[PDB]
């Protein structure tokens, strides 16, 4: 039976690096790595370097597409130093590593030959502010599609992709667990924009950011491993993030192991798991590349859309 | 505010014909034209000839895309006489003319320079048989997404697009209003496949045929004009299709004008209108080209996705 997809193991995937140079130190890697992530330079070589090659092939080809349409329209012909921005989505559960995957990809792409402006935007910035989530009764549904300003998000990406000189995104504080009054992240005609968040691959009765992606990544694992990663990170954060007395979640710092395991499982149960099953996981079939992790965080399997 | 879309009037659209030759006679047109359609050679020149140009530009460019991915994969390099089939979806309400739009497009494309094999498949073939729709209680929901074998449909298109030597579709009788035992439409590595039906542009929790389209058309009009077209065609068919004594709908042939208007409005009300509002119309935002008709069937407006 034919298939839109081709499966790979790590063996088969890493043979597709060919000549791609590794342009990243073990220290540089460390500063991109998230708490509890296991990615090392081997993973970068065997997994991210083929990915970066695939993308660089598709960038140039994807630009022929937009050029056909401008030829058709009888249009100027595009300043070769403002091409149509290549837009990359990165999706997956809370805790699955997707933020690391995206920072790593940005660093690999920024170090490609001619130094492309490669911007990274997470959807956190487009969450409704808490006072607005309260109004909507959504303070316990952060991460659910409806907790985001999806219209503002779509505007932002439509602005960038349509060639705008600048586009602004709001900024979320993880310390305060709320949007920061007055803060802007300003994206300036980048060559590549990576957009990272839980539900970025969603589709619906309107045109959405997924409809603008030229390439998409989904970072996957079994649900039970993700929960284990999530709980263990919650426990770890008792002495990193929760320890700051300003942290919205400071009360958690003084939880016993067992108490924190109880809190963490409840949050997973009531918020993150439902979101993953109801909203995120149904977007996986469309991702261009699914990156499949084993219980140790290791990417050992891959699924590429060839159609 | 920037926009994925550009709007056109007929003036602006038809200037984009450039050199495209008209390769179709007034008689050839007639045999493609559906009952109550008003399309003539002018419409073909000013509307379909630019469309055919747009497509021919995108075909060659879309093939660079699939070629990038085979380069990446270290793959043979594609027999230039079996390229990856370009897949075109055509959608819209019952009665809106979409079947004519598709037959016309096929004829225009087949007459392009090097004589591309251009196949046309409607989703009718993939309706569940009546005995199966009865089983599911769906005999009065023909046209609703669930009245189709969507898995078989997706298989068919995945087969063709992935380069298969042949792929078979079942065949629906409009005379008998049921699938024909033993009938097959056989599609053989065409260069272009047009797929036409009500809901072909749908998205969902699985990969669907819309995810395989390289280009999509939606044929649009105000809902009240479509109803008027539908009712008037139902009345007309009293002496064409319904007149055949074998026709499943023969009892309608003997309806008075007023009685047929009553029957037709009820079918619109209970089946076609709900389907259009709930299922078809929410797919319009994704179509590459929306063809907007006035109350006389005339295409006077267009909306192209540039993103
Ligand atoms: N259990 C929890 N409760 C509150 N805040 C949490 C949390 N777990 C993580 N956070 C915070 O929110 C963000 C979590 O990102 P998330 O887990 O959704 O994606 P991810 O898995 O890609 C992060 P990374 O790849 O860097 O490990 C981090 O910035 C962290 O500070
Ligand atoms: N009111 C009705 N009741 C039963 N059968 C009908 C019908 N109206 C049309 N049909 C039949 O079913 C098909 C209708 O196609 P539909 O209206 O869904 O698309 P369309 O508007 O693109 C057709 P065309 O473009 O040729 O006018 C035709 O083959 C016709 O024989």
XYZ file of C-alpha atoms and ligand atoms in Angstrom:
676
model
C 0.000 0.000 0.000
C 1.456 3.378 -0.992
C 1.883 6.070 1.613
C 2.410 9.776 1.879
C 5.076 8.985 4.479
C 8.495 7.448 4.676
C 9.760 5.974 7.969
C 13.424 6.044 9.078
C 15.543 4.679 11.883
C 18.535 6.643 13.096
C 20.897 4.523 11.018
C 19.029 5.338 7.839
C 18.393 8.981 8.705
C 21.954 9.872 9.581
C 23.353 8.608 6.266
C 21.562 11.610 4.764
C 23.855 14.139 6.373
C 26.274 13.937 3.442
C 28.670 16.872 3.609
C 26.743 19.089 6.057
C 29.272 20.770 8.422
C 28.733 20.757 12.191
C 28.865 24.406 13.198
C 28.094 24.212 16.919
C 30.182 23.636 20.058
C 29.301 21.450 23.022
C 29.059 24.615 25.077
C 26.823 26.366 22.551
C 24.574 23.308 22.672
C 24.349 23.489 26.480
C 22.890 26.998 26.429
C 20.126 25.904 24.072
C 19.342 22.666 25.966
C 16.326 22.650 28.279
C 16.106 21.279 31.816
C 15.972 17.482 31.621
C 16.836 17.296 27.897
C 19.515 14.792 26.840
C 20.446 16.081 23.414
C 24.215 16.008 22.709
C 26.425 16.665 19.686
C 25.932 13.157 18.370
C 22.156 13.690 18.166
C 22.852 17.005 16.504
C 25.071 15.307 13.918
C 22.933 12.307 13.126
C 19.481 13.942 13.439
C 19.598 17.709 13.072
C 22.191 17.914 10.303
C 20.145 15.883 7.760
C 17.120 17.960 8.797
C 19.038 21.131 8.143
C 20.037 19.760 4.709
C 16.454 18.847 3.829
C 15.407 22.358 4.753
C 18.062 24.097 2.680
C 17.037 22.105 -0.363
C 13.383 23.012 0.204
C 14.015 26.689 0.868
C 15.354 27.384 -2.617
C 12.685 25.203 -4.286
C 9.886 26.695 -2.215
C 10.989 30.095 -3.510
C 10.522 28.981 -7.140
C 6.858 28.428 -6.153
C 6.263 31.995 -5.008
C 8.166 33.224 -8.054
C 5.896 31.362 -10.484
C 2.969 33.218 -8.968
C 4.636 36.607 -9.328
C 5.554 35.801 -12.942
C 1.894 34.930 -13.495
C 0.769 38.180 -11.863
C 3.157 40.309 -13.943
C 5.104 41.388 -10.876
C 8.454 43.191 -10.333
C 10.529 40.033 -9.593
C 11.652 40.107 -5.927
C 14.745 41.802 -4.533
C 17.020 38.780 -4.069
C 17.915 40.227 -0.646
C 14.275 40.190 0.458
C 13.023 36.748 -0.538
C 9.667 35.440 0.677
C 10.384 34.314 4.279
C 10.453 30.540 4.761
C 8.171 29.693 7.688
C 8.765 26.660 9.874
C 6.368 25.371 12.496
C 7.457 23.287 15.498
C 4.827 21.519 17.594
C 4.343 18.904 20.327
C 3.328 18.341 23.946
C 4.443 20.337 26.916
C 7.683 18.716 28.162
C 8.511 16.853 24.975
C 11.550 18.953 24.131
C 10.052 20.977 21.246
C 11.565 24.228 22.488
C 15.017 22.760 22.418
C 14.433 21.259 18.968
C 13.534 24.755 17.798
C 16.442 26.649 19.382
C 18.790 24.035 17.998
C 17.309 24.303 14.498
C 17.569 28.099 14.619
C 21.260 27.878 15.529
C 21.989 25.371 12.805
C 20.175 27.443 10.199
C 21.744 30.742 11.302
C 25.161 29.181 10.749
C 24.379 28.228 7.159
C 26.706 29.602 4.554
C 25.496 33.137 3.903
C 24.233 33.885 7.422
C 20.435 33.953 6.978
C 18.461 36.046 9.475
C 16.717 33.216 11.364
C 14.130 34.360 13.897
C 12.438 32.248 16.564
C 8.994 32.989 17.970
C 7.076 30.908 20.518
C 3.316 31.176 20.841
C 3.600 32.069 24.514
C 3.584 35.757 23.495
C 0.121 35.306 22.009
C -1.517 33.847 25.089
C -4.322 36.051 26.394
C -3.274 37.988 29.503
C -4.437 36.454 32.792
C -7.054 39.145 33.450
C -8.502 38.265 30.048
C -8.280 34.509 30.595
C -10.079 35.001 33.920
C -12.754 36.997 32.122
C -13.230 34.067 29.753
C -12.995 31.541 32.596
C -9.842 30.076 31.002
C -7.215 30.462 33.739
C -6.973 26.656 33.891
C -6.819 26.130 30.151
C -3.562 27.843 29.299
C -2.200 25.966 26.265
C -5.626 25.097 24.945
C -6.223 26.690 21.559
C -8.770 29.096 22.994
C -6.277 30.492 25.507
C -4.368 32.135 22.638
C -5.074 35.247 20.594
C -5.179 33.235 17.424
C -6.187 36.213 15.282
C -3.203 38.273 16.468
C -0.969 35.247 15.912
C -2.191 34.758 12.365
C -1.797 38.483 11.673
C 1.806 38.338 12.922
C 2.762 35.469 10.689
C 0.836 36.896 7.735
C 2.653 40.189 8.204
C 6.090 38.598 8.260
C 5.504 36.211 5.388
C 3.951 38.867 3.136
C 7.251 40.753 3.303
C 6.680 43.321 6.035
C 9.613 45.432 7.265
C 8.748 44.741 10.867
C 6.141 42.780 12.818
C 5.724 42.789 16.591
C 4.760 39.950 18.981
C 3.846 40.358 22.652
C 6.090 38.767 25.309
C 5.176 36.290 28.041
C 6.955 36.137 31.434
C 7.575 32.575 32.664
C 8.550 34.120 35.996
C 5.212 35.899 36.333
C 3.106 33.475 34.310
C 1.538 36.453 32.512
C 2.039 38.748 29.493
C 4.502 41.583 30.158
C 2.970 45.088 29.864
C 4.808 46.975 27.120
C 7.134 44.200 25.957
C 7.549 43.534 22.217
C 9.562 40.993 20.234
C 10.294 42.623 16.889
C 10.887 40.484 13.814
C 12.428 42.272 10.819
C 12.065 40.624 7.410
C 13.920 37.468 8.461
C 14.847 34.875 5.839
C 13.493 32.076 8.028
C 10.949 32.362 10.830
C 10.525 29.436 13.193
C 7.241 29.372 15.027
C 7.031 27.102 18.015
C 4.078 26.192 20.243
C 1.640 23.401 21.231
C -1.059 23.848 18.647
C 0.630 25.687 15.788
C -0.292 22.864 13.430
C -4.026 23.217 13.941
C -6.443 23.577 11.086
C -9.971 25.050 11.101
C -12.777 27.049 9.484
C -10.390 29.896 8.868
C -6.933 30.251 7.397
C -4.456 29.614 10.263
C -0.676 29.802 10.775
C -0.332 26.147 9.791
C -1.631 27.201 6.401
C 1.445 29.422 6.082
C 4.107 26.908 7.105
C 6.532 25.867 4.388
C 7.849 23.089 6.651
C 6.661 21.722 9.988
C 8.207 19.557 12.735
C 6.310 17.542 15.332
C 8.305 16.202 18.314
C 6.697 12.992 19.544
C 6.937 10.357 22.266
C 4.637 7.909 24.027
C 2.213 9.700 26.256
C 3.463 7.956 29.408
C 7.063 8.987 28.829
C 5.961 12.566 28.300
C 4.104 12.522 31.590
C 7.193 11.097 33.291
C 9.315 13.821 31.758
C 6.809 16.434 32.867
C 6.594 15.262 36.475
C 10.322 14.859 36.875
C 10.917 18.357 35.480
C 8.305 19.787 37.827
C 10.268 18.210 40.750
C 13.578 19.535 39.403
C 12.208 23.038 39.155
C 11.699 23.183 42.892
C 15.338 24.281 43.158
C 15.673 26.151 39.850
C 12.687 28.223 38.691
C 10.281 27.767 41.624
C 13.037 28.769 44.058
C 12.959 32.401 42.955
C 10.776 34.081 45.549
C 9.231 36.214 42.799
C 8.150 33.159 40.854
C 4.393 32.840 40.596
C 4.891 29.201 41.520
C 7.204 29.729 44.506
C 4.884 27.859 46.876
C 5.863 24.704 45.026
C 9.517 24.974 46.070
C 8.722 23.656 49.567
C 6.741 20.618 48.397
C 8.061 17.202 49.373
C 8.859 14.829 46.529
C 5.580 12.982 47.030
C 3.570 16.190 47.302
C 5.126 17.544 44.084
C 4.439 14.278 42.301
C 0.847 14.675 43.381
C 0.568 18.273 42.182
C 2.330 17.510 38.892
C 0.176 14.518 37.992
C -2.965 16.525 38.672
C -1.851 19.335 36.348
C -0.940 16.745 33.717
C -4.266 15.004 34.199
C -6.515 18.068 34.102
C -4.675 20.306 31.603
C -1.774 18.910 29.620
C -2.891 15.400 28.856
C -6.364 16.441 27.582
C -4.791 19.146 25.471
C -2.346 16.645 23.969
C -4.992 14.025 23.143
C -7.727 16.444 22.016
C -5.733 19.133 20.236
C -2.033 18.506 19.651
C -1.867 14.840 18.664
C -4.546 15.234 15.977
C -2.165 17.600 14.201
C 0.636 15.047 13.917
C -0.513 13.546 10.629
C 0.245 16.759 8.785
C 3.719 17.575 10.094
C 6.395 17.332 7.418
C 8.822 15.602 9.863
C 7.829 13.758 13.035
C 10.791 13.305 15.436
C 10.087 10.258 17.596
C 11.797 9.984 21.001
C 12.288 6.956 23.233
C 11.893 6.972 27.014
C 15.392 8.422 27.371
C 14.590 11.510 25.216
C 16.585 9.975 22.394
C 15.422 10.557 18.825
C 15.615 7.062 17.331
C 12.868 7.166 14.671
C 11.603 9.625 12.038
C 8.614 9.988 9.670
C 8.976 12.268 6.625
C 6.062 13.362 4.414
C 7.018 12.736 0.851
C 3.489 13.736 -0.151
C -3.313 45.196 6.733
C -1.458 42.498 4.784
C -3.341 39.506 3.473
C -2.719 36.037 2.186
C -5.173 36.872 -0.602
C -5.395 39.066 -3.640
C -8.803 40.099 -5.028
C -9.526 40.634 -8.750
C -12.359 41.852 -10.921
C -12.820 40.409 -14.383
C -11.062 43.376 -15.964
C -7.968 42.813 -13.875
C -8.048 39.022 -14.105
C -8.369 38.798 -17.858
C -5.309 40.979 -18.506
C -3.343 38.013 -17.159
C -4.124 35.794 -20.110
C -1.103 37.115 -22.012
C -0.386 34.820 -24.944
C -2.441 31.785 -23.856
C -4.125 30.277 -26.972
C -7.834 29.417 -26.967
C -7.979 25.765 -27.962
C -11.703 25.034 -27.690
C -14.686 25.426 -30.034
C -18.133 26.723 -29.153
C -19.439 23.239 -29.833
C -16.800 21.570 -27.664
C -17.812 23.959 -24.889
C -21.486 22.976 -25.233
C -20.783 19.311 -24.511
C -18.996 20.204 -21.286
C -21.633 22.739 -20.141
C -24.158 21.616 -17.531
C -27.917 22.169 -17.534
C -28.593 25.799 -16.620
C -24.943 26.913 -16.906
C -24.233 30.115 -18.859
C -20.534 29.777 -19.546
C -19.520 30.834 -23.090
C -16.236 31.306 -24.948
C -15.793 34.804 -23.588
C -15.823 33.489 -20.003
C -13.402 30.814 -21.109
C -11.070 33.448 -22.565
C -11.172 35.988 -19.784
C -11.426 33.590 -16.805
C -10.214 30.097 -17.619
C -7.243 31.036 -19.793
C -5.420 33.021 -17.051
C -6.238 30.154 -14.673
C -4.715 27.690 -17.077
C -1.600 29.908 -17.298
C -1.280 30.150 -13.518
C -1.485 26.381 -13.330
C 1.161 25.732 -15.966
C 3.571 28.009 -14.154
C 2.889 26.210 -10.868
C 3.128 22.712 -12.307
C 6.788 23.046 -13.263
C 7.672 24.859 -10.008
C 5.740 22.395 -7.876
C 7.862 19.658 -9.445
C 11.090 21.339 -8.268
C 9.671 20.847 -4.741
C 9.306 17.083 -5.033
C 12.712 16.945 -6.704
C 14.443 18.697 -3.794
C 13.119 15.966 -1.534
C 14.384 13.180 -3.778
C 17.793 14.876 -4.008
C 17.797 14.995 -0.207
C 16.839 11.317 0.010
C 19.555 10.237 -2.443
C 17.001 9.033 -4.971
C 17.188 7.958 -8.656
C 15.952 11.288 -10.141
C 12.515 10.739 -11.752
C 11.829 9.538 -15.284
C 10.909 12.839 -16.952
C 7.996 10.977 -18.581
C 6.581 9.974 -15.196
C 6.659 13.175 -13.157
C 4.878 13.427 -9.808
C 1.197 13.944 -10.777
C -0.112 17.462 -10.157
C -3.351 17.174 -8.180
C -6.099 19.764 -8.453
C -9.153 19.933 -6.233
C -12.433 21.566 -7.288
C -15.105 22.244 -4.674
C -18.388 24.085 -4.061
C -22.118 23.672 -3.463
C -24.449 21.426 -5.354
C -25.723 23.451 -8.346
C -22.974 26.049 -8.338
C -21.404 24.897 -11.588
C -18.288 23.206 -10.139
C -18.624 20.196 -12.427
C -18.568 22.386 -15.474
C -15.612 24.375 -14.131
C -13.774 21.071 -13.795
C -14.618 19.602 -17.212
C -13.647 22.899 -18.778
C -10.327 23.008 -16.910
C -9.568 19.422 -17.937
C -10.161 20.280 -21.599
C -8.014 23.379 -21.429
C -5.188 21.515 -19.723
C -5.373 18.501 -22.056
C -4.872 20.867 -24.983
C -1.675 22.316 -23.538
C 1.375 22.048 -25.709
C 2.689 18.534 -25.150
C -0.674 16.835 -24.561
C -0.577 16.006 -20.828
C -2.712 13.068 -19.676
C -5.340 14.999 -17.681
C -7.779 12.822 -15.750
C -10.996 13.925 -14.055
C -12.510 12.165 -11.056
C -15.626 13.210 -9.133
C -16.225 12.046 -5.583
C -19.563 10.525 -6.544
C -17.747 7.207 -7.124
C -16.725 7.156 -3.469
C -20.192 7.565 -2.015
C -21.221 4.573 0.087
C -23.706 2.340 -1.746
C -27.348 2.886 -0.766
C -27.623 -0.399 1.145
C -24.654 0.794 3.195
C -26.007 4.317 3.653
C -29.288 2.781 4.840
C -27.342 0.634 7.286
C -25.746 3.795 8.660
C -29.049 5.691 8.543
C -27.542 8.114 5.997
C -29.867 7.789 2.992
C -30.848 11.443 3.496
C -27.323 12.726 3.968
C -25.812 11.993 0.585
C -23.165 14.695 0.058
C -22.395 15.018 3.737
C -18.807 14.040 4.467
C -19.894 10.887 6.259
C -21.788 9.614 3.215
C -18.461 9.047 1.432
C -15.844 6.328 1.779
C -13.230 8.856 2.720
C -10.577 6.216 3.399
C -10.990 4.685 -0.070
C -10.925 8.184 -1.557
C -7.705 9.083 0.216
C -6.162 5.756 -0.813
C -7.074 6.455 -4.453
C -5.464 9.852 -4.499
C -2.455 8.648 -2.507
C -2.003 5.821 -4.991
C -2.099 8.099 -8.016
C 0.098 10.817 -6.574
C 2.736 8.384 -5.287
C 3.301 7.293 -8.887
C 1.175 4.170 -9.223
C 0.725 2.570 -12.660
C -3.004 2.317 -12.181
C -5.577 3.212 -9.530
C -9.273 2.357 -9.649
C -12.318 4.373 -8.477
C -15.872 3.045 -8.179
C -18.600 4.537 -10.406
C -21.891 6.149 -9.403
C -25.053 6.017 -11.567
C -26.989 9.309 -11.628
C -29.785 7.389 -13.343
C -30.020 4.876 -10.506
C -28.795 7.119 -7.700
C -26.527 4.285 -6.525
C -23.037 2.811 -7.051
C -22.818 0.527 -10.097
C -21.887 -3.102 -9.269
C -18.632 -3.941 -11.050
C -17.913 -0.540 -12.593
C -14.396 0.934 -12.346
C -12.857 4.205 -13.517
C -9.179 3.482 -14.090
C -6.622 6.269 -13.814
C -3.172 5.507 -15.252
C -0.269 7.678 -14.099
C -1.826 10.895 -15.415
C 0.221 14.099 -15.434
C -2.657 16.029 -13.864
C -5.544 14.625 -11.841
C -8.533 16.850 -11.172
C -10.629 15.808 -8.228
C -14.057 17.329 -7.984
C -16.695 17.090 -5.245
C -18.504 19.008 -2.460
C -16.145 18.491 0.426
C -12.804 17.686 -1.184
C -11.235 20.642 0.599
C -11.995 19.365 4.080
C -9.367 19.048 6.749
C -9.376 16.849 9.875
C -7.616 14.635 12.422
C -6.159 12.578 9.624
C -4.334 13.309 6.402
C -7.029 13.901 3.730
C -7.136 14.468 -0.045
C -6.971 18.227 0.486
C -3.565 17.607 2.005
C -2.473 16.243 -1.378
C -3.785 19.034 -3.600
C -1.160 21.114 -5.370
C -3.858 23.608 -6.406
C -7.512 23.980 -5.443
C -10.521 25.844 -6.890
C -13.666 26.822 -5.006
C -16.677 27.952 -7.087
C -18.739 30.408 -5.056
C -21.949 32.432 -5.141
C -24.419 33.900 -2.663
C -26.402 31.202 -0.978
C -29.737 32.517 -2.278
C -28.612 32.459 -5.896
C -27.397 28.902 -5.468
C -30.769 27.871 -4.112
C -32.455 29.584 -7.060
C -30.161 27.769 -9.449
C -30.881 24.493 -7.693
C -34.664 24.842 -7.749
C -34.800 25.984 -11.341
C -32.606 23.060 -12.423
C -34.802 20.641 -10.499
C -37.811 22.002 -12.493
C -35.902 21.751 -15.782
C -35.001 18.151 -15.117
C -38.641 17.154 -15.169
C -38.317 16.870 -18.955
C -34.657 15.822 -19.196
C -33.343 13.406 -16.553
C -36.512 12.715 -14.532
C -38.394 11.893 -17.742
C -36.516 8.631 -18.239
C -38.856 6.021 -16.815
C -35.852 4.188 -15.362
C -34.751 7.247 -13.434
C -34.917 6.760 -9.691
C -36.586 10.158 -9.575
C -39.150 9.578 -12.337
C -42.083 10.368 -10.041
C -40.907 13.967 -10.106
C -41.522 14.322 -13.849
C -45.284 14.702 -13.298
C -45.014 17.388 -10.609
C -46.606 20.748 -11.343
C -44.306 23.759 -11.250
C -45.509 24.684 -7.770
C -45.237 21.119 -6.497
C -41.668 20.819 -7.832
C -40.735 24.135 -6.268
C -42.024 22.735 -3.012
C -40.079 19.479 -3.294
C -36.897 21.259 -4.395
C -36.894 23.809 -1.585
C -37.392 21.053 0.968
C -34.404 19.087 -0.352
C -32.348 22.287 -0.355
C -33.513 23.104 3.152
C -32.938 19.696 4.736
C -29.843 18.473 2.850
C -27.965 20.851 0.589
C -28.114 24.101 2.478
C -26.965 22.582 5.816
C -24.165 20.776 4.041
C -23.044 24.010 2.376
C -23.075 26.080 5.579
C -21.690 23.384 7.906
C -19.176 21.622 5.681
C -18.408 23.167 2.298
C -18.259 26.898 3.004
C -15.810 26.457 5.896
C -13.337 25.089 3.360
C -13.377 28.210 1.191
C -10.630 30.039 3.060
C -8.050 27.513 1.938
C -8.816 27.253 -1.776
C -6.029 28.620 -3.953
C -8.566 30.327 -6.301
C -12.148 31.230 -5.408
C -14.306 31.848 -8.523
C -17.151 34.166 -7.531
C -20.359 34.132 -9.605
C -23.159 36.686 -9.786
C -26.859 35.827 -9.929
C -26.558 35.158 -13.662
C -23.848 32.463 -13.202
C -21.271 34.937 -14.441
C -17.785 34.833 -12.936
C -17.102 38.508 -12.219
C -14.751 38.324 -9.207
C -11.761 36.219 -8.107
C -9.658 35.674 -4.953
C -6.159 34.188 -5.338
C -4.036 32.931 -2.424
C -0.633 34.454 -2.734
C 0.240 32.907 0.630
N 5.205 22.201 35.332
C 5.355 23.487 35.045
N 4.662 24.432 35.705
C 4.881 25.705 35.413
N 5.760 26.086 34.492
C 6.473 25.198 33.770
C 6.261 23.850 34.053
N 7.037 23.148 33.235
C 7.732 24.013 32.492
N 7.401 25.268 32.798
C 7.928 26.485 32.079
O 7.240 26.810 30.824
C 8.080 26.422 29.699
C 7.773 24.953 29.361
O 7.842 24.663 27.971
P 7.173 23.270 27.436
O 7.428 22.136 28.352
O 5.764 23.592 27.082
O 7.955 22.983 26.039
P 9.362 22.174 25.851
O 9.222 20.807 26.397
O 9.710 22.327 24.425
C 10.567 23.194 26.815
P 12.328 22.703 26.535
O 12.448 21.950 25.107
O 13.304 23.810 26.656
O 12.577 21.483 27.575
C 9.512 26.664 30.202
O 9.946 27.988 29.840
C 9.424 26.481 31.732
O 10.027 27.589 32.400
N -32.125 18.140 -7.629
C -31.544 17.004 -7.991
N -32.036 15.816 -7.598
C -31.447 14.709 -8.024
N -30.387 14.726 -8.825
C -29.820 15.878 -9.240
C -30.416 17.059 -8.805
N -29.709 18.066 -9.305
C -28.730 17.545 -10.049
N -28.776 16.213 -10.020
C -27.756 15.314 -10.675
O -26.529 15.100 -9.899
C -25.448 15.883 -10.481
C -25.478 17.283 -9.843
O -24.189 17.852 -9.660
P -24.044 19.137 -8.659
O -25.163 20.093 -8.807
O -23.758 18.585 -7.307
O -22.681 19.865 -9.168
P -22.551 20.991 -10.345
O -23.400 22.154 -10.012
O -21.101 21.207 -10.516
C -23.146 20.096 -11.851
P -22.822 21.015 -13.423
O -21.595 22.045 -13.191
O -22.601 20.155 -14.607
O -24.082 22.027 -13.565
C -25.750 15.874 -11.988
O -25.062 14.780 -12.623
C -27.283 15.723 -12.077
O -27.627 14.668 -12.976
